[PDB]
């Protein structure tokens, strides 16, 4: 979640998913911020809240 | 539910005692008090009264005691401090 992407909207013959803004490289214009995007975070990230021990 | 149980209450009996403390946090000093009470009677003679205390004297010269009580209740807070001040002013008038 490091970048600052935002969706471009409809009317451009392109998908709705968030695009990397800016310009000047091959990176600008690619998708972000989704589990089905490359170099994007996964849905339901694991955490240390999980119960590690049981009680007998 | 506390009402009916309070009507019947018996206290466990213990023998009492009264012993004064070895080192108290407050030692009443007789010498230290009498210098404060003697110095105040000297300073009130050289200095005068407050401008609200001068008006309360001249009202008490007309014997408007019921008028002078509401005059001091508006200035000071409590009713006890009014009746302590009237005894100081009725002597000086």
């Amino acid at each position: 979640m490091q970048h600052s992407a935002v969706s471009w909207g409809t009317g451009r013959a392109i998908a709705r998913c968030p695009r990397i803004g800016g310009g000047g490289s091959r990176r600008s214009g690619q998708g972000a911020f989704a589990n089905f995007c490359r170099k994007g975070r996964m849905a339901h990230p694991t955490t240390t809240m999980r119960r590690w021990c049981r009680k007998i | 539910m506390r009402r009916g149980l309070k009507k019947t209450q018996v206290h466990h009996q213990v023998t009492k005692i009264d012993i004064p403390k070895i080192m108290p946090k407050y030692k009443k000093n007789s010498k230290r008090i009498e210098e404060k009470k003697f110095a105040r009677s000297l300073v009130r003679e050289i200095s005068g009264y407050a401008p609200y205390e001068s008006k309360a004297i001249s009202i008490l010269k007309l014997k408007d005691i019921a008028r002078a009580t509401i005059f001091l209740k508006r200035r000071l807070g409590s009713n006890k401090r009014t009746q302590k001040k009237i005894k100081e002013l009725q002597i000086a008038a």
């Binding site: - | 210098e35 110095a39 000297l42 200095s47 009264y49 401008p51 609200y52």
Partner: protein, 203 residues
Amino acid sequence: AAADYIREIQKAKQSDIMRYLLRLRVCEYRQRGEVFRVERPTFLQRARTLGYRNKEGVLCYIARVKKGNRKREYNNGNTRGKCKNARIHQITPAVRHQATAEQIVGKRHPNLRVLNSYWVNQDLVYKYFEVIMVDPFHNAIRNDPKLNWICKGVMKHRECRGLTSASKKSRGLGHGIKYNNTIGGSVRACWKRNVTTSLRRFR
């Protein structure tokens, strides 16, 4: 003895003596600036109980505050929000006017540290206070055990953190059930430990 005849004289501030003497000093203060330097304190017996000692390295100053509320400053009364919070005029400050007198004199002199302050006299427009400041880097105050505590590291700028006795009262500390807030340290320390839920190991 002579400590008691002076303290009873300077207590009654409505008498014939003190009304005469306070009128002269106010006319002396208006010719001066904001902060100026006096040699000996005006209220001698009051300043002595607050820790003053006639030693070299103990200095006294006098400042002034304008005695009123302070207005919020927006362009036209537009706060750009809801109507729950749009009041401008009737808002009271957080600390007393004794505390704001210390921040003025403490900022102008970064050389020294502050001890205490008290009231002197009033006008229509101003309130006058006297501040007592002491040098930490003098060799006469670095050596005695009576004031050796003020040369520590944690005693720098006690006004900006609210540790002097003038501004300590506004934080609301004490014993009992009336001070249920600030039950640990400060106000914000009491709130943080109450909201957070504890997740133990076995549960």
